[PDB]
Amino acid sequence: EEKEILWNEAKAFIAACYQELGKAAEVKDRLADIKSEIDLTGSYVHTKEELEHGAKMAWRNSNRCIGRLFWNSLNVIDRRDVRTKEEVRDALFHHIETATNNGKIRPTITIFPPEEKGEKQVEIWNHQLIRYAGYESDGERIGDPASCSLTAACEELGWRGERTDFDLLPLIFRMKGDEQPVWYELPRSLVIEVPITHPDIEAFSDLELKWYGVPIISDMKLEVGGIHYNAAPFNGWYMGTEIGARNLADEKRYDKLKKVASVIGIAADYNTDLWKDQALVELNKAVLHSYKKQGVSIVDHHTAASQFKRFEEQAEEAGRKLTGDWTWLIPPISPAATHIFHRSYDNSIVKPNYFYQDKPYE
Amino acid sequence: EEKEILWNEAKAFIAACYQELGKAAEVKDRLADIKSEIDLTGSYVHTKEELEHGAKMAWRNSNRCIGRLFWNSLNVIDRRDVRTKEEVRDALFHHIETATNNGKIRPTITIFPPEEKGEKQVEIWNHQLIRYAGYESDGERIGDPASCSLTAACEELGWRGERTDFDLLPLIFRMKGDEQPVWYELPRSLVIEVPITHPDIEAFSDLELKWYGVPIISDMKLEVGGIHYNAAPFNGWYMGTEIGARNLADEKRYDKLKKVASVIGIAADYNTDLWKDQALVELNKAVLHSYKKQGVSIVDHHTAASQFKRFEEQAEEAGRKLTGDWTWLIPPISPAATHIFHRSYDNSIVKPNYFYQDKPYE
Ligand code: HEM
Ligand code: HEM
Ligand SMILES: CCN(CCc1ccc(NC(=N)c2cccs2)cc1)Cc1cccc(NC(=N)c2cccs2)c1
Ligand SMILES: CCN(CCc1ccc(NC(=N)c2cccs2)cc1)Cc1cccc(NC(=N)c2cccs2)c1
Ligand SMILES: C[C@H](O)[C@H](O)[C@H]1CNc2nc(N)[nH]c(=O)c2N1
Ligand SMILES: C[C@H](O)[C@H](O)[C@H]1CNc2nc(N)[nH]c(=O)c2N1
Numbered sequence: 001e002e003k004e005i006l007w008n009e010a011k012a013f014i015a016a017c018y019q020e021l022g023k024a025a026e027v028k029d030r031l032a033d034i035k036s037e038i039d040l041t042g043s044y045v046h047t048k049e050e051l052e053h054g055a056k057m058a059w060r061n062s063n064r065c066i067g068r069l070f071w072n073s074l075n076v077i078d079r080r081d082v083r084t085k086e087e088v089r090d091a092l093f094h095h096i097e098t099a100t101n102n103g104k105i106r107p108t109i110t111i112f113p114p115e116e117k118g119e120k121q122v123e124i125w126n127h128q129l130i131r132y133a134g135y136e137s138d139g140e141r142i143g144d145p146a147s148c149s150l151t152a153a154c155e156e157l158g159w160r161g162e163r164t165d166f167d168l169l170p171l172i173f174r175m176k177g178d179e180q181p182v183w184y185e186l187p188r189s190l191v192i193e194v195p196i197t198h199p200d201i202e203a204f205s206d207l208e209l210k211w212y213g214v215p216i217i218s219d220m221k222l223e224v225g226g227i228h229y230n231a232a233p234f235n236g237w238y239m240g241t242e243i244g245a246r247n248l249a250d251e252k253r254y255d256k257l258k259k260v261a262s263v264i265g266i267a268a269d270y271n272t273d274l275w276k277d278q279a280l281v282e283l284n285k286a287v288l289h290s291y292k293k294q295g296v297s298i299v300d301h302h303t304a305a306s307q308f309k310r311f312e313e314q315a316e317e318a319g320r321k322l323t324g325d326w327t328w329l330i331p332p333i334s335p336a337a338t339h340i341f342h343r344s345y346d347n348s349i350v351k352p353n354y355f356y357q358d359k360p361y362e
Numbered sequence: 363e364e365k366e367i368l369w370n371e372a373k374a375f376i377a378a379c380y381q382e383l384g385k386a387a388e389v390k391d392r393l394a395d396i397k398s399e400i401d402l403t404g405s406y407v408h409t410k411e412e413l414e415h416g417a418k419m420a421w422r423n424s425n426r427c428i429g430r431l432f433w434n435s436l437n438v439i440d441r442r443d444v445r446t447k448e449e450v451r452d453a454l455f456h457h458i459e460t461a462t463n464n465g466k467i468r469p470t471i472t473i474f475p476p477e478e479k480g481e482k483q484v485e486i487w488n489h490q491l492i493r494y495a496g497y498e499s500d501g502e503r504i505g506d507p508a509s510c511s512l513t514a515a516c517e518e519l520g521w522r523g524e525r526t527d528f529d530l531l532p533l534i535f536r537m538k539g540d541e542q543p544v545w546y547e548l549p550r551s552l553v554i555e556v557p558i559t560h561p562d563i564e565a566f567s568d569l570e571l572k573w574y575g576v577p578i579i580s581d582m583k584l585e586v587g588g589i590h591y592n593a594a595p596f597n598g599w600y601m602g603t604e605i606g607a608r609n610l611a612d613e614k615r616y617d618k619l620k621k622v623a624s625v626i627g628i629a630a631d632y633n634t635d636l637w638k639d640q641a642l643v644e645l646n647k648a649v650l651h652s653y654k655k656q657g658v659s660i661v662d663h664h665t666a667a668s669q670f671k672r673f674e675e676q677a678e679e680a681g682r683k684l685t686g687d688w689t690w691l692i693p694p695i696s697p698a699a700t701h702i703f704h705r706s707y708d709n710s711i712v713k714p715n716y717f718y719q720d721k722p723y724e
């Protein structure tokens with residue numbers, strides 16, 4: 001049944017992939033090599049081309065992603081060769097560097113060896129490669145609550161955060177054969193951060209807000225033709241609302257709106273004043289302004305929505321069925337101002353794709 | 363099969379309804395009377411109590427409605443007695459008057475005779491009892507585009523709009539036996555309207571915006587225990603975003619955001635300025651301010667969301683399953699600022715309920 005799932009998935013991916021790459025006549029032969037390889041080894045190894053296009057396809061199939069227009073230009077780094085934690089660390093360091101690209105962010109994925117018998121070769125603990133720690137000690141909240149459990153797990157392994165609101169978590173990951181993960185402090189010279197200022201309102205800097213430049217998701221499983229790449233960190237750039245409307249605004253995150261309201265000089269007393277909405281808008285304007293001023297790639301939700309419309313059009317133009325999760329595609333501010341809000345999407349799961357997988361801690 | 367659908371629906375409604383009304387011991391007897399009545403007449407007639415509670419239940423079951431907390435206080439007017447168009451008109455006029463209640467809006471439903479063999483007794487053409495007309499003549503857009511087809515149909519029947527942006531449509535409805543509907547101009551003394559001004563920004567009145575006080579939906583079918591009340595106009599008060607974020611903001615509606623941006627003194631040139639979002643917020647603040655200043659009931663989306671949370675809690679407290687349509691429950695501005703955004707809802711259809719039905723024109 002396992003070998004059969006793998007074989008079925010492989011036939012479907014190879015046929016589709018080679019169709020897209022104009023390699024349709026190589027399918028029969030390639031499928032044979034695969035079937036022998038599976039019968040002999042219990043698995044199979046992707047060609048560079050297959051792996052690259054699989055990564056792109058997987059992005060194209062991400063129902064929740066609004067930034068899919070640029071799926072075909074994903075920069076793919078093949079690190080299936082790594083065997084050592086030094087090699088894993090250096091590959092991660094490198095991913096940060098080349099993705100960041102001095103602020104001109106390059107959408108990049110680094111692909112590590114896949115699971116074998118469901119056995120991971122490399123198991124990454126970070127949610128993102130760059131993320132802030134979180135502390136909840138008897139009433140005292142510091143930093144990013146989202147990171148509380150990972151931060152605690154890391155503080156078991158001999159690490160210690162400074163307990164500012166913006167401690168960078170180290171890389172933490174475990175190698176097959178090892179009982180505990182290792183951790184490595186990030187070289188600060190690799191991490192670009194952006195101070196949040198506002199274009200009109202001088203006092204906004206009193207909040208002393210900042211965010212990191214590059215969101216690099218490192219806890220999702222890339223699935224390509226039956227092969228499970230549990231360790232395959234990927235990055236794009238931010239949509240502004242992600243920082244301004246969620247990370248800095250959520251009560252369960254940094255919870256800044258009341259402070260935003262105060263520094264922008266409005267009362268936060270009455271629901272009917274719509275102070276939350278007003279604070280949300282200024283904070284999000286601040287975010288967009290700050291990233292642009294700092295030479296760090298970012299997109300506003302109107303432009304993003306506008307780009308995603310082009311993606312919908314391209315799919316139709318290419319005869320590809322379009323899938324999407326409406327509940328995640330709509331931006332958390334002014335959703336009815338985008339076309340997404342006014343149409344529906346089929347939320348069917350298509351592979352290749354990126355999937356959630358169990359956290360290795362907690 | 364028809365009589366069987368009716369009988370099944372009736373058993374389910376009577377049992378549930380009488381359970382809620384502490385009348386559980388009357389179910390067996392009441393069900394018998396119903397079964398005889400159906401076998402003899404092909405239908406059955408609701409008691410006043412049944413009809414009233416059915417109307418309330420139907421509201422409680424409206425997955426898309428955020429205002430459901432107040433379901434049990436719905437004011438029900440039983441007009442199953444009407445036979446003439448004069449009687450229908452007067453019942454509609456009256457509904458407007460008592461619902462409006464000088465601005466202190468009373469959630470009210472007026473229930474007309476139900477369909478017999480799927481044959482309507484009274485067929486209402488209006489979407490709402492109070493609504494603005496719409497004209498689209500070679501490039502020239504006037505009024506509310508949503509009302510274009512109904513306005514045209516009405517202008518077949520000898521009526522003529524003045525072609526302002528805010529022409530009130532007359533009541534239009536048809537009686538069983540008649541080939542054409544009749545129409546009646548609304549007495550202006552019955553219609554409260556609100557000029558949109560802004561609390562801080564004097565120039566906002568230059569836009570010369572207004573909206574009507576009371577939204578009275580008059581084109582949905584109320585279904586209670588197998589009985590189809592196709593004609594049963596109902597009203598609540600407005601949630602501010604309905605006017606500020608949709609009716610006045612939608613490009614396919616009044617499309618005012620660029621004009622809002624100009625009178626509030628911001629540029630409407632760059633997506634990254636978030637001028638749409640900023641314009642949305644000021645316009646919605648204007649709406650809330652204007653309705654409150656005029657002594658007309660309205661609710662902001664935070665308070666509404668807050669009330670709907672209490673409704674969720676009540677359902678649980680009463681052992682009632684809760685149903686909801688997440689895509690409609692989230693407000694079109696700052697949705698992530700409400701709890702609704704951060705949970706899920708079962709979108710199952712439960713009866714009694716209000717349903718769409720085919721437009722009689724177009
Ligand atoms: C190029 C810029 C990109 C932008 C602006 C963008 C935007 C977004 C946003 C706003 C979300 C929702 C995130 C949230 O609410 O937490 C999202 C989700 C997602 N994006 Fe993208 N994205 C981009 C590139 C990419 C890339 C390069 C990949 C992978 C190759 C990707 C795959 C995904 C996936 C898998 C999700 C779903 C995550 C989940 O389910 O939690 N995106 N994207
Ligand atoms: C008391 C104040 C009320 C408020 C503030 C309220 C709020 C809302 C809002 C904002 C919507 C979405 C409308 C849209 O986006 O077009 C809605 C939908 C709805 N409401 Fe309510 N509502 C109220 C009372 C009522 C009453 C009295 C009824 C009926 C007895 C009702 C039944 C419904 C139904 C059936 C829908 C769905 C309409 C559709 O599918 O298009 N509501 N409500
Ligand atoms: C933090 C919010 N999301 C992920 C949301 C999420 C993911 C996974 C879980 N799973 C859980 N185990 C938990 C749920 C609740 C507590 S833990 C919960 C939430 C991060 C994210 C994902 C994908 C894209 C982006 N934004 C981006 N622009 C990109 C990053 C990388 C490429 S594009 C952000
Ligand atoms: C105009 C927007 N909605 C209804 C949305 C809608 C309904 C029905 C259709 N059906 C169609 N036939 C069409 C679709 C497209 C063109 S016509 C389309 C849209 C009006 C509405 C419905 C229910 C509640 C409210 N708001 C209110 N606060 C209340 C009114 C009455 C009681 S509460 C507003
Ligand atoms: C319950 C709800 O579906 C869920 O909380 C979603 C709503 N849509 C979202 N959309 C995005 N982009 N990100 C999120 O975290 C959420 N939360
Ligand atoms: C396609 C989408 O589901 C649809 O256009 C909905 C979204 N949610 C909505 N919610 C409300 N309250 N009103 C609407 O008109 C819509 N439009």
Ligand SMILES: [Cl-]
Pocket residue numbers: 215242247
């Ligand atoms: Cl993030």
Ligand SMILES: [Cl-]
Pocket residue numbers: 577604609
């Ligand atoms: Cl409306």
